Design an enzyme around this catalytic site. Structure first.
Site, short mmCIF file in Angstrom:
data_model
loop_
_atom_site.label_atom_id
_atom_site.label_comp_id
_atom_site.label_asym_id
_atom_site.label_seq_id
_atom_site.Cartn_x
_atom_site.Cartn_y
_atom_site.Cartn_z
N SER A 180 0.64 -1.47 0.06
CA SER A 180 -0.18 -0.11 0.01
C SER A 180 0.63 1.13 -0.10
O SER A 180 1.78 1.60 0.81
CB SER A 180 -1.22 0.07 1.10
OG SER A 180 -1.79 -1.23 0.99
N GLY A 181 0.28 2.15 -0.93
CA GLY A 181 0.99 3.30 -1.16
C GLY A 181 2.13 3.02 -1.93
O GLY A 181 2.79 4.14 -2.56
N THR A 185 0.21 2.90 -9.13
CA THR A 185 -0.45 3.82 -10.19
C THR A 185 0.28 4.64 -10.76
O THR A 185 0.01 5.24 -11.70
CB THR A 185 -1.77 4.20 -9.40
OG1 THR A 185 -2.56 3.27 -8.85
CG2 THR A 185 -2.38 5.06 -10.34
N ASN A 232 -1.32 6.74 2.42
CA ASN A 232 -1.17 7.20 1.41
C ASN A 232 -1.89 8.38 1.27
O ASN A 232 -2.32 9.04 2.19
CB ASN A 232 -1.71 6.44 0.21
CG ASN A 232 -1.43 6.86 -1.06
OD1 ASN A 232 -0.86 8.02 -1.40
ND2 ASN A 232 -1.66 6.06 -2.37
N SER A 235 -4.96 6.99 -2.10
CA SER A 235 -5.18 5.82 -1.89
C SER A 235 -6.28 5.22 -2.67
O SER A 235 -7.16 5.80 -3.30
CB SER A 235 -5.63 5.44 -0.46
OG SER A 235 -5.46 4.09 0.03
N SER A 236 -6.40 3.87 -3.07
CA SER A 236 -7.16 3.19 -4.03
C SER A 236 -8.23 2.57 -3.58
O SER A 236 -8.10 1.34 -3.22
CB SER A 236 -6.51 2.51 -5.12
OG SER A 236 -5.65 3.35 -5.82
N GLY A 456 -1.47 -6.53 -3.49
CA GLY A 456 -0.80 -7.35 -2.78
C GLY A 456 -1.36 -7.58 -1.06
O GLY A 456 -1.96 -6.67 -0.83
N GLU A 458 -1.64 -7.21 2.05
CA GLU A 458 -1.07 -6.63 3.07
C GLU A 458 -1.65 -6.96 4.41
O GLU A 458 -3.19 -6.98 4.59
CB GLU A 458 -1.09 -5.02 2.95
CG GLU A 458 -0.16 -4.09 3.78
CD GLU A 458 -0.33 -2.79 3.15
OE1 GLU A 458 -0.28 -2.52 1.96
OE2 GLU A 458 -0.50 -1.75 3.96
N1 LIG Z 1 8.22 6.58 -9.02
C1 LIG Z 1 7.55 7.76 -8.32
N2 LIG Z 1 8.09 8.90 -8.54
C2 LIG Z 1 7.55 9.95 -7.75
N3 LIG Z 1 6.41 9.69 -7.14
C3 LIG Z 1 5.93 8.47 -6.87
C4 LIG Z 1 6.64 7.35 -7.45
N4 LIG Z 1 5.83 6.18 -7.21
C5 LIG Z 1 5.11 6.56 -6.38
N5 LIG Z 1 5.02 7.84 -6.05
C6 LIG Z 1 4.08 8.58 -5.44
O1 LIG Z 1 4.11 7.96 -4.10
C7 LIG Z 1 2.38 8.13 -3.99
C8 LIG Z 1 1.99 6.65 -3.85
O2 LIG Z 1 2.20 6.00 -5.06
P1 LIG Z 1 1.03 5.47 -5.68
O3 LIG Z 1 1.41 5.20 -6.97
O4 LIG Z 1 -0.14 6.41 -5.59
O5 LIG Z 1 0.62 3.81 -5.09
P2 LIG Z 1 -0.46 3.06 -4.99
O6 LIG Z 1 -1.70 3.52 -5.92
O7 LIG Z 1 -0.16 1.51 -4.71
O8 LIG Z 1 -1.36 3.53 -3.42
C9 LIG Z 1 2.19 8.62 -5.01
O9 LIG Z 1 1.00 9.59 -4.55
C10 LIG Z 1 3.01 9.38 -5.80
O10 LIG Z 1 3.15 10.50 -5.61
MG LIG Z 2 -3.87 2.49 -7.95
#
Ligand SMILES: Nc1ncnc2c1ncn2[C@@H]1O[C@H](COP(=O)(O)OP(=O)(O)O)[C@@H](O)[C@H]1O
Ligand SMILES: [Mg+2]
Length: 758
Positions: A180-181, A185, A232, A235-236, A456, A458
């Site tokens: 998570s986080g 995405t 996060n 969050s989704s 995954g 968690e």
């Molecule tokens: N490779 C990256 N570079 C910059 N920011 C990232 C990167 N990966 C994730 N983030 C940041 O981390 C936060 C969480 O990632 P996210 O893609 O939203 O994961 P999830 O959808 O699993 O919760 C995002 O809001 C994004 O700003």
């Molecule tokens: Mg997502």
């Protein structure tokens, strides 16, 4: 090729930054190092140990503190030769032990490279910082090249997935999954984007119509699906399955999306420091007095579905303007004017149903001393205000053979309205998926690059039903990568001039995949979906059966020694204890029936189509009437896996830096413990089972034949030439198993020649 250009940022951004020289006059010592964790307790948190005498059993030490502790020959996590640290394929490694794994990337992540290859899995740790690895110039590079050809980067996973589609003429699938986080995405969003230019439909550079149509679906899938949370901010609430559709002649067609369970209850509950659906915290800012009036509205704090939370604003986030961004991605999808007032104005009811308070005084019966707030949902829904409540307070219920309007107590009454909510948000989320789908996905389909993002397993404090579901998956998809690699472990199994001894596995995770889903003899959702139909028996009697059958006979289960509302299954990550509050009430997922009765009839083309259009509320057939939510899930699942059982997969294990959400520090605690449980390590310890260190066989003969002045720098067929440094350095036949194109110098004794001398 900018790769030639040293300055060209790609060197500093994605590469370890090749140093000037390439000789033995470089990274130098002659000794051996081993990973030791100094405290006889805390597992995670290792430290460099020195070797003193490579004895038969008792490995010799000299702790960073300078002590003399002595571990066994087979438990001292040894430390990889430095020539290697921060190398792209963790497979390249000659020692794969938890520390010696967390080290090769601590460092690279440390040099600002977030992407590191591992066997197949692209592992990437989340920055939290803004990094320039995404510019168009970036696109321009990873274009049309091989995994080995260029840097470890997400763009590679796709270009590869991409050419691949049209060289084998089969559909493909990327899989972004993990903590998570942890950021799926953000990449899942940058891959689709790579799918925007390399196969970009734009006649002239950029985009045309379908591209933005397809590209601004997200702002949408986010302002409504996504919530802020404890781990996060984006969050989704659900999961998703987008595939991108192309023709036989190399171009995009339309596309896809597949959402799964929303956090439907979050709509009505926001734990401290966690916010409700994002659209709710926008429509209240990015509007006018012709919109709040247009739908009775007071500042985003008067609503009891938004304040009870303990927080509203988001450090560094124009909620106010974040709203515009999402109204345009509507216009582009041809979202019509009447089309938006309706989505929102239909949201707005869900705000109000909240400012409605069930009072009580008729002996024990709730009543309404205030009709004002309902005056809106009845109002903006365009339904009956009298019945809205009259179906709210005294609904007609069939007890046996008689139709008898009941009156729920001060509690079951409000609780029932609380159901009329997810109903609008589910059915409304639903229709927003149907709608995009319609203007994006064509019929004459050819190949596909399926992107699925979903969480995954968690592990947490309470694990209500919703989750027994999203491990069910990561137990299924986990078994997959387990199985697929076996069938691929047959290939190189055919051509090395010798075909190894048949190896079998089957995956013991199968016993549990039944425990959850089994029909005969039945498992959790089986005996569950059995009591989900008797409308009298309750949890206690249910959490009581899941102990009858299994407690003491089924290996992967653990009745709670004390608690009488818990029970514990054991996954690809291990034990989990589950709850039983409303499991019955939710697989069942009811809602009083004078409500669909009264809403079925509305002034709306979107309020009505949701209660009247069975493509929305109805499920498929079985029980004696409409099937149940866990039943639906199990069937709707295999419709997917049996939808990957034909394509080429592509995996992405995502890893988080810290649960503190901050850049520039790697908890040697959090990170190393996302590692060991997830198969990333595991699918390469397995193939090591022979020799994990395998290479292109062009390099070793150039990587080490001078410590034995017998094989030269430029020999052409090391197949008959690299040999001359084996009958002189002396490697016994068991000590390695080479190949006719590639090679894999021994499973173990390799550094005895790799780190010490020319
Ligand atoms: N490779 C990256 N570079 C910059 N920011 C990232 C990167 N990966 C994730 N983030 C940041 O981390 C936060 C969480 O990632 P996210 O893609 O939203 O994961 P999830 O959808 O699993 O919760 C995002 O809001 C994004 O700003
Ligand atoms: Mg997502």
């Amino acid at each position: 090729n900018p790769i030639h250009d040293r300055t060209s940022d790609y060197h500093k951004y994605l590469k370890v930054k090749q140093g000037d020289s390439d000789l033995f006059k470089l990274t130098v010592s002659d000794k051996r190092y081993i990973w030791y964790n100094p405290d006889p307790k805390e597992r995670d948190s290792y430290e460099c140990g020195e070797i003193v005498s490579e004895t038969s059993d008792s490995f010799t030490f000299k702790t960073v503190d300078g002590q003399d502790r002595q571990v066994k020959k087979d438990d001292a996590n040894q430390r990889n030769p430095i020539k290697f640290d921060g190398v792209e394929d963790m497979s390249e490694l000659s020692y794969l032990n938890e520390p010696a794994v967390f080290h090769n990337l601590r460092v690279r992540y440390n040099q600002d490279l977030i992407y590191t290859y591992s066997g197949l899995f692209l592992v990437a740790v989340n920055p939290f910082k803004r990094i320039p690895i995404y510019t168009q110039e970036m696109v321009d590079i990873f274009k049309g090249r091989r995994r080995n050809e260029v840097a470890p980067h997400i763009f590679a996973i796709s270009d590869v997935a991409y050419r691949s589609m049209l060289d084998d003429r089969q559909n493909q699938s990327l899989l972004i999954t993990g903590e998570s986080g942890a950021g799926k995405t953000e990449n899942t969003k940058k891959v689709i984007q790579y799918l925007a230019s390399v196969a970009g439909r734009n006649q002239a550079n950029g985009s045309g119509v379908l591209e933005q149509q397809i590209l601004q679906a997200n702002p949408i899938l986010e302002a409504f699906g996504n919530a802020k949370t404890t781990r996060n901010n984006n969050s989704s609430r659900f999961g998703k399955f987008i595939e991108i559709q192309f023709n036989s002649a190399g171009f995009i067609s339309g596309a896809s999306i597949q959402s799964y369970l929303l956090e439907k209850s979050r709509v009505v509950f926001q734990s401290e420091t966690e916010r409700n659906y994002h659209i709710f915290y926008q429509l209240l800012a990015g509007a006018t007095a012709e919109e709040k009036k247009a739908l009775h509205l007071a500042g985003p704090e008067s609503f009891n579905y938004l304040n009870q939370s303990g927080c509203v604003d988001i450090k560094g986030v124009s909620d106010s303007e974040e709203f515009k961004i999402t109204r345009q991605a509507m216009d582009i999808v041809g979202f019509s004017q009447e089309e938006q007032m309706s989505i929102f104005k239909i949201i707005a009811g869900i705000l109000h149903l909240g400012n409605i308070k069930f009072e009580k005084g008729a002996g024990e019966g709730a009543v309404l001393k205030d009709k004002t707030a309902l005056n809106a949902a009845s109002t903006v829904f365009g339904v009956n205000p009298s019945v809205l409540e009259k179906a709210l307070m005294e609904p007609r219920i069939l007890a046996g053979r008689d139709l008898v309007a009941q009156h729920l107590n001060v509690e079951k009454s409000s609780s029932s309205r609380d159901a009329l909510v997810k109903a609008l948000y589910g059915r409304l989320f639903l229709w927003l998926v149907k709608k995009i789908n319609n203007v994006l996905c064509q019929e004459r389909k050819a190949y596909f690059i399926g992107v699925l993002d979903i969480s995954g397993f968690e592990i947490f404090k309470v694990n209500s039903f919703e989750q027994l579901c999203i491990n069910y998956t990561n137990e299924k998809l986990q078994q997959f990568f387990n199985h697929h690699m076996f069938k691929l472990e047959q290939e190189e199994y055919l051509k090395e001039k010798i075909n190894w001894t048949f190896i079998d596995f089957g995956l013991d995770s199968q016993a549990t995949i039944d425990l959850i889903d089994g029909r005969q003899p039945p498992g959790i959702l089986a005996l569950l979906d059995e009591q989900s139909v008797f409308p009298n028996a309750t949890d206690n009697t249910l959490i009581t059966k899941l102990h009858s059958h299994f407690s003491k006979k089924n290996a992967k289960y653990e009745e709670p020694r004390f608690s009488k509302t818990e029970f514990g299954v054991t996954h690809y990550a291990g034990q989990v204890m589950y709850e039983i509050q409303d499991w019955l009430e939710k697989n069942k997922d009811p809602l009083q029936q004078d409500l669909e009765l009264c809403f079925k009839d509305s002034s709306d083309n979107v309020v009505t189509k949701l209660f009247n259009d069975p493509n929305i509320a109805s499920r498929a057939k079985k029980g004696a009437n409409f099937i149940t939510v866990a039943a639906q899930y199990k069937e709707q699942l295999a419709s997917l896996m049996a939808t990957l059982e034909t394509t080429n997969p592509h995996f992405v294990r995502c890893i988080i830096p810290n649960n503190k959400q901050l850049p520039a520090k790697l908890e040697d605690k959090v990170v190393l413990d996302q590692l060991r449980c997830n198969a990333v390590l595991e699918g390469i310890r397995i193939t090591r089972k022979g020799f994990p260190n395998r290479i292109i066989y062009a390099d070793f003969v150039k990587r080490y034949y001078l410590l034995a002045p017998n094989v030269p720098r430029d020999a052409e067929d090391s197949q008959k030439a690299t040999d001359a440094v084996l009958k002189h350095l002396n490697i016994d036949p068991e000590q390695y198993r080479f190949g006719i194109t590639k090679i894999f110098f021994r499973a173990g004794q390799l550094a005895r020649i790799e780190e010490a001398r020319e």
